[PDB]
Amino acid sequence: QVQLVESGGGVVQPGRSLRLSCAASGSTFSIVAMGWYRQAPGKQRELVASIITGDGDTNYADSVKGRFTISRDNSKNTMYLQMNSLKPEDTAVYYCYARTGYGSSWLMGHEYDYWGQGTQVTVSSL
Amino acid sequence: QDPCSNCPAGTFCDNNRNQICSPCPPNSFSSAGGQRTCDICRQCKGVFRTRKECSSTSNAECDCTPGFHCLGAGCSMCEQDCKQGQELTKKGCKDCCFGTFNDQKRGICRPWTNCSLDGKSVLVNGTKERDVVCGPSPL
Ligand SMILES: *[C@@H]1O[C@H](CO[C@@H]2O[C@@H](C)[C@@H](O)[C@@H](O)[C@@H]2O)[C@@H](O[C@@H]2O[C@H](CO)[C@@H](O[C@@H]3O[C@H](CO[C@H]4O[C@H](CO)[C@@H](O)[C@H](O[C@H]5O[C@H](CO)[C@@H](O)[C@H](O)[C@@H]5O)[C@@H]4O)[C@@H](O)[C@H](O[C@H]4O[C@H](CO)[C@@H](O)[C@H](O)[C@@H]4O)[C@@H]3O)[C@H](O)[C@H]2NC(C)=O)[C@H](O)[C@H]1NC(C)=O
Ligand SMILES: *[C@@H]1O[C@H](CO[C@@H]2O[C@@H](C)[C@@H](O)[C@@H](O)[C@@H]2O)[C@@H](O[C@@H]2O[C@H](CO)[C@@H](O)[C@H](O)[C@H]2NC(C)=O)[C@H](O)[C@H]1NC(C)=O
Ligand SMILES: [Cl-]
Ligand SMILES: [Cl-]
Ligand SMILES: [Cl-]
């Protein structure tokens, strides 16, 4: 019902910026809230930022408070994560995530959640 | 059966004379057939404001003045509305207790969904106004 496509991965030196994009398709009205997850090899999946599509409130993880900004644009039906002041630790696979209800509720004809393919974000120097 | 039983709506049983089915007085109605007398229309006054007009056949339907909401069956009474993130107490509207929420003008503050109880992480914390958004299964 909902498809999510990531864009804007890549390699960067520490301190440089990068901006992840997640484009939603199909039943985009189902979506209520969205987020970015990241997965480093060895360590666990970590929630990075979340967002309410409606009102636009954001939750950030302590480890990126100040440095990352999550935002949404309904016109373009996309969610962005601006990542500034990148660190080695930020290196992980960034997955885009979307939900269709409040609490553990989900919209009748749709999926409880949806994921994207993930983009790779590498920060090492030279 | 009875004479007075095909008496249509808008009329009552009359005796004084040559009318079986005489029409209802003003500010009275009967949606029945064969009624003995016509019911006097509901008055919507004060807090209430008339939504539907009164008719011979159907009663008037009470709305409820803006600032208030309809309550009980048929808008029997009218209760004051708070904004979201509040519930109506004994003394008046009050903000939701920390860890409860209400997303409506009317109603009671309910408690946030507990995400762990349903086996999900949390995606978004709740506010006074908004519920929690459970995320995926952990690990
Ligand atoms: C969502 O609800 C969560 C779950 O609620 C509870 O469990 C489920 C199954 C439901 O049935 C609910 O009805 C029920 O209330 C909730 O997380 C719960 O939070 C309470 C406290 O709020 C936890 O109990 C606490 O334990 C503290 C730390 O002790 C740990 O380490 C000890 C080391 O040995 C160990 O004894 C203890 O073991 C108990 O917990 C495990 C889970 O790990 C449980 O399964 C097992 O049966 C044991 O009973 C535990 O690991 C205590 O120090 C603390 O008590 C202290 O503070 C009190 C303050 O008044 C003092 O009076 C008291 O004497 C102590 O000093 C406290 O009671 C509860 O175990 C925990 N449940 C789980 C499964 O993690 C969660 O927070 C809710 N989420 C939201 C958004 O609200
Ligand atoms: C989103 O929610 C959790 C839950 O935190 C608790 O409840 C919140 C509404 C607020 O009262 C917090 O101050 C409470 O701690 C937040 O995770 C907490 O993060 C802090 C800081 O690292 C940690 O010390 C707490 O113990 C965490 N609590 C638990 C139970 O894990 C999270 O950061 C919130 N994010 C927001 C509102 O932006
Ligand atoms: Cl753009
Ligand atoms: Cl009046
Ligand atoms: Cl109403």
Q: What is the resolution of this structure in A?
A: 3.1
Residue of B118, B132, B134, B137 for testing the chain A interface, max A β-carbons within 10 Å: B134
Report d(CA A115, CA A124) in Å as an integer: 27
CB B55 within 8 A of CB B46: no
Which ligand is located closest to the Cα atom of residue B48?
A: 4
Residue A45 contacts B where some CB pair is shorter than 8 Å: yes
Cβ-based neighbours of B116, under 8 Å, separated by 6 or more:
none
Token pair recorded at residue B27: 């500010």
The DSSP string of B5-50 is: GS--TTEEE--SSS-SEEEPPTTEE--SSS-SSPEEPPP--TT--E
Report d(CA A36, CA A113) in Å as an integer: 13
The DSSP string of A72-91 is: EETTTTEEEEEE-S--GGG-
CB A49 within 8 A of CB B122: no
Q: What are phi and psi of B77, to 5 degrees?
A: -150, 180
Residue of B nearest to A51 (CA): B124
Report d(CA A64, CA B83) in Å as an integer: 34
Across chain A, how many H-helices and E-strands are there?
Answer: 0, 11
The C-alpha angle B20, B26, B27, rounded to 5 degrees, equals 120
CA-derived radius of gyration, chain B: 26
Handedness of CA A41, A47, A49, A52 (dihedral sign): positive
Domains in chain B: boundaries: 1-64, 65-139
For position A55, which CATH number holds? 2.60.40.10
Range of the domain at A77: 2-122
Number of domains comprising chain A = 1
Nearest Cα residue to atom 35 of ligand 2: A59
- Distances in Å between the Cα of B17 and the Cα atoms of A83, B22, B46, B128 are 91, 10, 41, 68
Strand partners, B13: B21
